[PDB]
A paper describes a structure:
Some of the most potent bnAbs target a quaternary epitope at the apex of the surface [name] envelope ([name]) trimer. In this manner, the trimer apex forms an immunogenic, structurally conserved motif consisting of an electropositive hole surrounded by N-linked glycans. Apex bnAbs discovered so far can be grouped according to their heavy chain (HC) complementarity determining region (CDR) 3 topology: (1) PG9-like with—or predicted to have—a hammerhead motif (Doria-Rose et al., 2015, Doria-Rose et al., 2014, Gorman et al., 2016, McLellan et al., 2011, Pancera et al., 2013); or (2) PGT145-like with a long, anti-parallel β-hairpin (McLellan et al., 2011, Sok et al., 2014). The elongated HCDR3 conformation of this PGT145-class bnAbs results in a paratope that projects a long distance away from the surface of the Fab and enables epitope recognition at the C3 axis of the trimer apex via a long-range interaction (Sok et al., 2014).
Author numbering:
A (entry chain H): 1 to 52, 52A, 53 to 71, 71A, 71B, 71C, 71D, 72 to 82, ...
B (entry chain B), E (entry chain I), F (entry chain J): 520 to 551, 568 to 664
C (entry chain A): 32 to 58, 66 to 141, 150 to 185, 185A, 190 to 309, 312 to 321, 321A, 322 to 398, ...
D (entry chain L): 1 to 27, 32 to 91, 96 to 106
G (entry chain G): 184 to 185, 185A, 190 to 223
H (entry chain G): 80 to 127
The structure:
């Protein structure tokens, strides 16, 4: 089952640093970019970033520079992989549904999505 | 000139280099770890096999030992519609190849039987004279 | 009267095709092992008058073959080599305090352990200097960083890892087309085509951020991003001039030898002669500025010419791409190149010394099934190289065609192979063909 | 510089209506379906191919930057928000209603 | 028909498929671990070698490039005693092969010299005219 | 006699065994661990390759299928200065080979074009008649 | 082991042995030229 | 079938210590020797 594990919802007071996560399941993670997306409730999706799981390499919008980080991890037997997203601080406009996705192809096809989680402030 | 120099000229002019072109079919492996050496070996085999397949066909066609031959097989004009001089005098053979490319297996079957098996039958009749 | 199709042979025909490349070389080094057949000093290029040919970068599988050919070599060189698994014994340590330059503090640890003598029944105390990068605390004492990962091995330090050019030759009945056009886009047709049966050597040398010792662009700095709108793609950058870089390992390295079993020498780091200093690299500051100006001019070809261009500190991720790394001098190095990117560009003393790091446990490529120890090399390391290009990436989500920014990135070795191999494609010669004639076959 | 537009707003169409939505964009275009409380799913990609397991009702076409998506015989289960996307950029959602 | 279809008919009828039969001498290895791949390699070599041995013989015999040839070598009638039509019209070539099988090396030596070396000597004399 | 028996006689007499000599070009590997077996494999490949190179040349020269041929290419007398009978009747072919050995690539190029490419051009003209 | 004993080669590459069943008695070996030689 | 063929009227140079058959034999046997031992069990427990 290719579907990603999705971490549970959480809420913190403003200025908090937070973490969310996902986990690889049915496929070889090395061959696909992982992406993060967020959306305000009542609003269209906003891209957050991507990470090259082989190298741990993040890519983020100028908007989020210095505020977010992406990490990746793997089982010592390498049969699972995990991803995390960190935010250094929170503001009320950081509330969003947050989720992981898999880049199926170079058209940025997203045939796998985490259920997402709700982050609130 | 040199190998593939004919790519710069029309099909009729390409005939001038055909013996040159044949030179490199088996060439460059003449003088000599699992890594590499097994690869070399595979390359040697490949070169040989391809060479033989062509020779086999020529022997079937009766065109063996020649770079130019004269088959007795007429071709269905629908495959191309250009005056013969308009073909031979204005294109790289490769360009022409692209045009002919969807009829090539028709032709090969024809060469095998429409003239060569048939010729051989007639040759046998002559052999009985 | 009606035309007869007839046989011809040796007519040139090209088909795109893939065959295994044949290794060859000029005249033990891992890269050639001296097993490649030596080749003739006769690069008889044949200009192909009146032809053009499509070449698609990132589509050629010569790149892939090179990528796995070198891997196979690497493993081949190490299969003879002795396992280091006796070294997973825990170590006592201290920070080295002997003649430490202030910015080197805590870089090295002196440690010791109870590991075995070559006798089955005996053990001995052993100690060596170690880089902090190669160890982790055993708990919040240390252990090698890879003892919870596939085992570390190393022997056969005599083999050289210095790059040697490697040539590839088409199998008989095949040929390598090449494009000489100085303006060539990574993909599509080229008017400059000429051919060779084989190619000039290409070094196996690798880098994690900047191309080293690559051929220079023929005319101007050039960029090959594939479809640039997709910013997940790595951006190739090729300099049309060299940028000299000098580096050192200023510490006077010394070596120790250990027996860990019969026939099993084990290298260890001796105490350094003299004051401890950080490894470093020098580049021209002025030249670096100038070449960046050349680069931004190239970047603007895809943007309005008043757009903002920016460079940046690395975004992190694994160290192997977070920093620039190389094996020059036979030993691995890493450096903080982010200072090179501390600039922005707008419409309209003489050198820099980068800080560096050394790690002796090498996890090659992306593989996690293997690791190896790098032996100490006595004396000061000196390195000289020409920087020939950049591997860059671009941040997603930009708007209003402005403030595009870039960072060092990639690190898949495949792109290094591409930096040279984009010049060529393999085709198959199909000498057989037919054409209509006025001739009909002669009577038996 | 990628840019995109869409015309769907929201639609009042009745069940069983074949319906269409359109967009235009620079570059390759993918379309998605989403429902409240749920992750988006791919419908069609690169302006022409349905994702595997997409219902037969879905279809579409491309003409350069033009893109069209339709649902034959719309079903009540198909009421959802919809998207057009190019790389990191996506149009705000639009939706079916009745 | 197809490969080996001639096994269902008499020797004279078998002549009709000879070009078909030649098609599979090198065929089926055209498109492509020590296990298997080494075996494949051995198979590739074997196919080539056998093919060449036959071609070599035909070149000696002067029958190269032909599936039917006309040697000048008479054979000693003791090897078989059947009317010629009684042979050609009633048996699978293979059945006939079993009958001939103990004389085959006699014949091959004869082909090499009794006609071909001798012919070549005469050819040289003609070359001197 | 047997293989290489002609080494005991003059070049004209050597012609008598030429078909014998050709017998061993592919022979002795007809019937059959990395050690040895890989070596065997290399030997098999080598034998094949050399055989093919010669056949290729003969096909170029138009001398294919023959152990004796009659090229139309005159040779520059400076390469040797002996009466023709004085050559053919008094030396091992090998001895003669040593004398000719520095002109051999001249000759091969001549055979390819001075007569065979040219002949083929003329053959084509005849093909158009 | 010091001026007890140790095998003479423990300070040299390791000693191995198994498969005593194989014979080391000489057998003649023939070498044959490749075809064309 | 050791079918020797006497070569009438010939001579040939032979140089001992120049033939590389010797070298091939020398390394062929080595390869065999190692091949026979690669299957074999290590005795390293005996350094006690
Ligand atoms: C990099 O990434 C990008 C981002 O995704 C990739 O996108 C691709 O970009 C390239 C070039 O920028 C495009 O190529 C060109 O695309 C257009 C659009 O093609 C479509 O429209 C066809 C109808 O077009 C006419 O009508 C429309 C308006 O309705 C006008 O916009 C047009 O201008 C035309 O007037 C339609 O028929 C096509 O679909 C059909 O064909 C495809 C097969 O190709 C089938 O699958 C479909 O089912 C269907 O049958 C399609 O929807 C074309 O107009 C272009 O044609 C011109 O250019 C060609 C070479 O560039 C040339 O061979 C053509 O004959 C034609 O040239 C004429 O016009 C030029 C000016 O427009 C003149 O300069 C020229 O001399 C001549 O007069 C061309 O095909 C890709 O389409 C686009 N991708 C997609 C999905 O659309 C890009 O591929 C990536 N690149 C690399 C290298 O990685
Ligand atoms: C971009 O490409 C450029 C060009 O390829 C690269 O630049 C070269 O890179 C290599 C690798 O870093 C450098 O090689 C190293 O150079 C050392 C110095 O060599 C010269 O000086 C010594 C005395 O110091 C002389 O003996 C040498 O003479 C030899 O070379 C000249 C030709 O230049 C010939 O004429 C001579 O006849 C000699 O053949 C040089 O003049 C050199 O010491 C070093 O070699 C040692 O290390 C290697 C393993 O890496 C051993 O194989 C070798 O045997 C040497 O080791 C001995 O010495 C050490 C102690 O010093 C002992 O511990 C050992 O046990 C052993 O006894 C090596 O060749 C090269 O100098 C450099 N070129 C320049 C211009 O700087 C860049 O690397 C490249 N960048 C990228 C990223 O790849
Ligand atoms: C790219 O460039 C960026 C920025 O130029 C680099 O990011 C910085 O890296 C350094 C080192 O990796 C970071 O410093 C480390 O911080 C930790 C903890 O710091 C916290 O506590 C401090 C007081 O102890 C406080 O001053 C810091 O506040 C800063 O950071 C917050 C963001 O988290 C920001 O809001 C503030 O305004 C300040 O900027 C902070 O709260 C500290 O433990 C480290 O010290 C140890 O290690 C050092 C040696 O590295 C050693 O000298 C010490 O004695 C001690 O052992 C160290 O200072 C810095 O915080 C990073 N900046 C940010 C914004 O996170 C980045 O490293 C570059 N890339 C790469 C690949 O290096
Ligand atoms: C480039 O391609 C073109 C065709 O694809 C070639 O064109 C040919 O050029 C030659 C010399 O420039 C022309 O030759 C001359 O023609 C006259 C006319 O009879 C003749 O009398 C002269 O003696 C001379 O040969 C030729 O007409 C022309 N066109 C053809 C052959 O169709 C050109 O040669 C190619 N260039 C190269 C370098 O291959
Ligand atoms: C099975 O084997 C036998 C011989 O082994 C084959 O027998 C042949 O059968 C055909 C048709 O049944 C006969 O052909 C006919 O003969 C007359 C006589 O002249 C002719 O005029 C007809 O036009 C027709 O061809 C043939 O006589 C007979 N015997 C032979 C050939 O000796 C039979 O064909 C084989 N079956 C198959 C399916 O191969
Ligand atoms: C050894 O080498 C020499 C030449 O290198 C060979 O000499 C030839 O020997 C034969 C018989 O001993 C001579 O043959 C006879 O010649 C007369 C003269 O016409 C002829 O009528 C006879 O019927 C007979 O054939 C021959 O003249 C002589 N010289 C040559 C051929 O130049 C000798 O045969 C070689 N020995 C061996 C065993 O190969
Ligand atoms: C090898 O084990 C080490 C721990 O011994 C693992 O290191 C972890 O690394 C991450 C990132 O720095 C930290 O969050 C953990 O706290 C570290 N663990 C400890 C024990 O320090 C590393 O992940 C292990 N590798 C394998 C493949 O499982
Ligand atoms: C190496 O091993 C020796 C014992 O083989 C260790 O010495 C022992 O240390 C522990 C606790 O440190 C004591 O309980 C024992 O009494 C010690 N043994 C003796 C004989 O006194 C030594 O500490 C080990 N070294 C390291 C660096 O771990
Ligand atoms: C790297 O360092 C070397 C020497 O430390 C520099 O080499 C100098 O090159 C110039 C130009 O030809 C010579 O005039 C000097 O004599 C050389 N120095 C020495 C000590 O020989 C080289 O320029 C440096 N490169 C960079 C980019 O800084
Ligand atoms: C890199 O270049 C720098 C200077 O360009 C060298 O640093 C000098 O070091 C010496 C002694 O260490 C000092 O006396 C100078 O003052 C330093 N220069 C500056 C500008 O600070 C450094 O040695 C060079 N390193 C290598 C490996 O070439
Ligand atoms: C590193 O230091 C060592 C010793 O501290 C240097 O070794 C010296 O080498 C010279 C010439 O080879 C000898 O005359 C000295 O006697 C050695 N020193 C000692 C203490 O034995 C070595 O040269 C230094 N490295 C470099 C690159 O100079
Ligand atoms: C860095 O690259 C340049 C250019 O490839 C090298 O300079 C060349 O040196 C060779 C041999 O000395 C000359 O034949 C070339 O003409 C030079 N290039 C140019 C453009 O003139 C330089 O040698 C390289 N650096 C090192 C350390 O080898
Ligand atoms: C030409 O060939 C086509 C199909 O290959 C066939 O339908 C047609 O009858 C043929 N006509 C002639 C005159 O050859
Ligand atoms: C060959 O056939 C293909 C598909 O049937 C067609 O697209 C192509 O244009 C044809 N080309 C030629 C030269 O016949
Ligand atoms: C060693 O250095 C680390 C930090 O570099 C420090 O935390 C530790 O206390 C030091 N230990 C000693 C014994 O100096
Ligand atoms: C036929 O051959 C046999 C032996 O093969 C021989 O004894 C007999 O004399 C020969 N007779 C004829 C007429 O060929
Ligand atoms: C061939 O010879 C063997 C034994 O000499 C004999 O048994 C067999 O019947 C013979 N067959 C033919 C067809 O000559
Ligand atoms: C013979 O050849 C030489 C060089 O091979 C040449 O110089 C000379 O002119 C030629 N003469 C004749 C008559 O062939
Ligand atoms: C061939 O040439 C070499 C050197 O040019 C010379 O020593 C030798 O005697 C020549 N031999 C013949 C037979 O031409």
């Amino acid at each position: 089952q290719v579907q990603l594990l999705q971490s549970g919802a959480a809420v913190t007071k403003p200025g908090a640093s937070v973490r969310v996560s996902c986990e690889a399941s049915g496929y070889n993670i090395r061959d696909y970019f992982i992406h993060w997306w967020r959306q305000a409730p009542g609003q269209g999706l906003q891209w957050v970033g991507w990470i090259n799981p082989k190298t741990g390499q993040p890519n983020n919008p100028r908007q989020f520079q210095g505020r977010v980080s992406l990490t990746r991890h793997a089982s010592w037997d390498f049969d699972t992989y995990s991803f995390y997203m960190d935010l250094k601080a929170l503001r009320s406009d950081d509330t969003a549904v947050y989720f992981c996705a898999r880049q199926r192809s170079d058209y940025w096809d997203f045939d796998v999505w985490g259920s997402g989680t709700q982050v609130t402030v | 000139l040199g190998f593939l120099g004919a790519a710069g000229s029309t099909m009729g002019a390409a005939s001038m280099t055909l013996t040159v072109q044949a030179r490199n079919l088996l060439s460059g492996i003449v003088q000599q770890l699992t890594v590499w050496g097994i690869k070399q070996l595979q390359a040697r085999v490949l070169a040989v096999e391809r060479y033989l397949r062509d020779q086999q066909l020529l022997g079937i066609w009766g065109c063996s030992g020649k770079l130019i031959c004269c088959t007795n097989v007429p071709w269905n004009s629908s495959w191309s519609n250009r005056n013969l001089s308009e073909i031979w005098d204005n294109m790289t053979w490769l360009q022409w190849d692209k045009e002919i490319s969807n009829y090539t297996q028709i032709i090969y079957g024809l060469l095998e039987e429409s003239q060569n098996q048939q010729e051989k039958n007639e040759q046998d009749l002559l052999a009985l004279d | 009267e009606n035309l007869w199709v007839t046989v011809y042979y040796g007519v040139p025909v090209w088909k795109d095709a893939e065959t295994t490349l044949f290794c060859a070389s000029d005249a033990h080094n891992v890269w050639a092992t001296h097993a490649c057949v030596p080749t003739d000093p006769n690069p008889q290029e044949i200009h192909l008058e009146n032809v053009t040919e499509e070449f698609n970068m990132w589509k050629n599988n010569m790149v892939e073959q090179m990528h796995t050919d070198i891997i196979s070599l690497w493993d081949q060189s190490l299969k003879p080599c002795v396992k280091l698994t006796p070294l997973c014994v825990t170590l006592q340590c201290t920070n080295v305090t002997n003649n430490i330059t202030d910015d080197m503090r805590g870089e090295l640890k002196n440690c010791s352990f109870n590991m075995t003598t070559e006798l089955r029944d005996k053990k001995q105390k052993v100690y060596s200097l170690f880089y902090r990068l190669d160890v982790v605390q055993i708990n919040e004492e240390y252990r090698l960083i890879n003892c919870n990962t596939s085992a570390i091995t190393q022997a056969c330090p005599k083999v050289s890892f210095e790059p040697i050019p490697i040539h590839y030759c088409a199998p008989a009945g095949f040929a390598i087309l090449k494009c000489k056009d100085k303006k060539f886009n990574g993909t599509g047709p080229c008017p400059s085509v000429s051919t060779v049966q084989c190619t000039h050597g290409i070094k196996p040398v690798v880098s994690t951020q900047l191309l080293l010792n690559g051929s220079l662009a023929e005319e101007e700095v050039m960029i090959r991003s594939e479809n640039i709108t997709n910013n997940a793609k790595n951006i190739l950058v090729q300099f049309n001039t060299p940028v000299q870089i000098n580096c050192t390992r200023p510490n006077n390295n010394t070596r120790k030898s250990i027996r860990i079993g019969p026939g099993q020498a084990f290298y260890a780091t001796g105490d350094i002669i003299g004051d401890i200093r950080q490894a470093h690299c020098n580049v021209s500051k002025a030249t670096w500025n100038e070449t960046l100006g050349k680069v931004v001019k190239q970047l603007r070809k895809h943007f309005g010419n008043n757009t903002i261009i920016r460079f940046a500190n690395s975004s992190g991720g694994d160290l192997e791409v977070t920093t620039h790394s190389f094996n020059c001098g036979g030993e691995f190095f890493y450096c903080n190149t982010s200072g090179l990117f501390n600039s922005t560009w707008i419409s309209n003393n003489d050198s820099i010394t980068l800080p560096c790091r050394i790690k002796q446990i090498i996890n090659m490529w992306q593989r996690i099934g293997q690791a190896m120890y790098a032996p100490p090399i006595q004396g000061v390391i000196r390195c000289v190289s020409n920087i020939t290009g950049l591997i860059l990436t671009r941040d997603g989500g930009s708007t209003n065609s402005t403030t595009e920014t870039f960072r060092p990135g990639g690190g898949d070795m495949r792109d290094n192979w591409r930096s040279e191999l984009y010049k060529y494609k393999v085709v198959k010669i199909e000498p057989l063909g037919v054409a209509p004639t006025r001739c009909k076959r002669r009577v038996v | 510089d990628i840019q995109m537009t869409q015309s769907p707003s929201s639609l009042s169409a009745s069940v069983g209506d074949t319906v269409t939505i359109t967009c235009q964009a620079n570059g390759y275009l993918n379309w998605y379906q989403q429902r409240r409380g749920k992750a988006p799913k791919l419908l069609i990609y690169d302006g022409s191919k349905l994702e595997r397991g997409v219902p037969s009702r879905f279809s579409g076409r491309r003409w350069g930057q033009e893109y069209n998506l339709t649902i034959n015989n719309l079903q009540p289960e198909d009421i959802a928000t919809y998207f057009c996307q190019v790389y990191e950029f996506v149009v705000p959602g639009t939706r079916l209603d009745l």
